[PDB]
Assembly symmetry: C3
Homo-oligomer: 89 residues x 3
């Protein structure tokens, strides 16, 4: 049908990350002030949400990717993506 997106941003440049769920895959587009590019995030999902927070100026991102009733948390903490501890139960 139509794709589904989620977005987050931080600072004042700003940095923006836009996640798109399309045909069962979530990909990431990124803005850091100098043109859009494709990010490192690539995981399966039919639905995506995101949140982020700063510690000082350092960004932490959590992406919630869902297929059917299964949601997986993906974590950015300054050195790549890792699977997080989030569960339903």
């Amino acid at each position: 049908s139509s794709v589904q997106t989620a977005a987050t941003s931080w600072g004042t440049v700003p940095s923006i990350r836009v996640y798109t769920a399309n045909n069962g895959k979530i990909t990431e587009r990124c803005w850091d002030g100098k043109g859009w590019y494709t990010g490192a995030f690539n995981e399966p999902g039919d639905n995506v949400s995101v949140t982020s927070w700063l510690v000082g100026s350092a960004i932490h991102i959590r992406v919630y990717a869902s297929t059917g009733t299964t949601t997986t948390e993906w974590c950015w903490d300054g050195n790549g993506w890792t699977k997080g501890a989030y569960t339903a139960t």
Copy 2:
């Protein structure tokens, strides 16, 4: 085809809240630094969005729950979830 989520976070710990719409009901999973647990929020909806802000250490949360063309705003201001003033028109 999947559940639909929304997420918010605050502070540096951080705290995180993830809302999931599934089979016409929205439920809440919570992180305050010491493991995921099930939150108090439980209301009807097929779609959810969220935003939040701090007043000191006190979180204020607004959840927008949609069923058909009706969106209800649910408010956390320190003492349970209450309906907010939000309307379509």
Copy 3:
């Protein structure tokens, strides 16, 4: 099944903006501490996400509107809504 919403907020009032995709159109409801009102944003879309950031006391808003596989970014920078440079991967 239901309308779909996206929300952002800023400052200490706070100000809130809620975008709703309904029947192929996205509209905007606004809170600046003094009651809900209808905003100027009105554009086509079946799905919506949003983020925002402050530069001094000035809000900047980015709304990601999707129709099929095409996502259009709409930009508020103090002087009306304009189309942004965002493109898909």
